[PDB]
């Protein structure tokens, strides 16, 4: 409980209409702390939205994945601020495997790459700068830093 259900539902109803570009998350195992790009096909009921993924595909690998998601797992695309230089300890998102995955900066930028660690995979690697962003949370219609 660090978001308010009433407000979140209202804001989601307001902003996520047909055609709206969004990010959606999943409760499925191994997908905690990941945001996928998508677009609202249409709202469903009062709490849900049919979305079509920008990058994720159906099993043939060709047709865009389509799924229902609820108002607690959908958000707008965050502002990108690319004036940013990452510092060690910064909570970030890194784009790979078709998604924005939560990670932590473990080494400052060198030669256009940043050292990154992912807690989910317990894996460490260097990422190209333009595949990284500062992590932000969508709360009650407002973008906030951690």
Residue numbers in the entry: 206 to 351
Give verbatim excerpts from the published study on this entry:
Here, we identify a previously uncharacterized H3K9me2-binding protein, which was named AGD-containing protein 1 (AGDP1). The AGDP1 protein possesses three pairs of tandem AGDs (AGD12, AGD34, and AGD56), all of which can specifically recognize the H3K9me2 mark. Our biochemical and structural studies reveal the molecular basis for the specific recognition of the dual marks H3K4me0 and H3K9me2 by the three tandem AGD cassettes of AGDP1. Our studies identify an H3K9me2-binding protein that regulates heterochromatic DNA methylation and reveal the molecular basis for the specific recognition of H3K9me2 mark, thus establishing an additional linkage between H3K9me2 and heterochromatic DNA methylation.
We also performed structural studies on AGD34 and AGD56 of AtAGDP1. We obtained the free-form structure of AtAGDP1 AGD34. The overall structure of AtAGDP1 AGD34 resembles that of RsAGDP1 AGD12 with all the peptide-binding residues, especially the H3K4me0- and H3K9me2-binding residues, conserved and occupying the same positions. The structure-based sequence alignment of AtAGDP1 and RsAGDP1 tandem AGD cassettes indicates that most of the peptide-interacting residues, especially the H3K4- and H3K9me2-binding residues, are conserved. Intriguingly, all three tandem AGD cassettes (AGD12, AGD34, and AGD56) can specifically bind to the methylated H3K9 mark with preference on H3K9me2, suggesting that a single AGDP1 protein has multiple H3K9me2-binding sites. In contrast, the AtAGD34 and AtAGD56 binds to H3K9me2 about twofold higher than H3K9me1, although the peptide-binding regions are quite conserved. Our in vitro binding data suggest that a single AGDP1 protein possesses three H3K9me2-binding sites and sequence alignment results indicate that the AGD12, AGD34, and AGD56 can each capture an H3K9me2 mark using the same mechanism.
